Paper text:
An effective prophylactic AIDS vaccine will need to generate anti-[name] neutralizing antibodies (Abs) that target the [name] envelope glycoprotein (Env) and broadly neutralize as many [name] isolates as possible (bNAbs). The [name] envelope protein (Env) consists of gp120 surface subunits and gp41 membrane-anchoring subunits assembled as noncovalent trimers of gp120/gp41 heterodimers to form mature, functional ‘spikes’ on the virion surface.
In the complex structures, HCDR3 forms the back wall of the epitope binding pocket. One of the ordered sulfates modeled into the structure sits near the middle of this concavity, coordinated by the guanidinium group of R94H and main-chain and side-chain contacts from S28H. While lipid cross-reactivity mediated by HCDR3 had been suggested to play a role both in inducing B cell tolerance and in increasing neutralization potency through interactions with viral membranes, mutual functionalities precluding an engineered solution, our results alternately suggest that viral membrane binding is so weak and nonspecific, and competes with [name] epitope binding, that it is unlikely to be involved in the induction of tolerance mechanisms or to play a key role in neutralization. Three types of IP3R were identified as top-scoring PhIP-Seq hits and validated by SPR.
Numbering used by the authors:
A (entry chain B): 1 to 27, 27A, 28 to 110
B (entry chain A): 1 to 52, 52A, 53 to 82, 82A, 82B, 82C, 83 to 100, 100A, ...
Write the structure that this text describes.
Amino acid sequence: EIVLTQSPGTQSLSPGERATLSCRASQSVGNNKLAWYQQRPGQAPRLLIYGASSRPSGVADRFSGSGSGTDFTLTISRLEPEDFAVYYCQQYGQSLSTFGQGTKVEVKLVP
Amino acid sequence: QVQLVQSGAEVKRPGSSVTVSCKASGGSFSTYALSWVRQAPGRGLEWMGGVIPLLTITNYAPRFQGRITITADRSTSTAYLELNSLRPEDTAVYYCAREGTTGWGWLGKPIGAFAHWGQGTLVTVSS
């Protein structure tokens, strides 16, 4: 399979901040067939990005996909309360579809 | 317009089988796929396989093929995931997700991206 590696696995951030999330592929993802999903607690995954950079209708434009080949990036600007969730990438450039292990975007609490 | 609704949570003994259902409404009359995705507790997402109900074509992930059966009833736009012999490892939320077709026309290879999801079905293996 194409192994997709999202790291780091957790990122601690504040509201208003920009988040960059990386997805790296063990092989080239054909035709940039890479999607991103947001999953809030208790909820089903929701599609944010497909074709690497395409945004479904009804997804806010602060979500942006970029990259190609083996190196893909989701950028979330102006983090809103709602955006603290787990984010997954997915390649479907081969018939055996695979997901990354997920990146948790969580609020940075002063310890 | 497209909505996917799954059958309710189930509790099952080890060695038993269970069948989870996913009913799709709305969308265009087309060769869409309904795929099944596993999420174990605290864990990530894994594609198990899928079916195109219009054409009775099924597609499995190799690591799941030996232990599951995926079918569809095309007249009710309902896809089914049977887990054939349950173990504790099989405790998970199972999601259905719909792959649409690409390009003009009702008839085409499903895209691999999942634009629509069911609410999930928790399967708990007791004992």
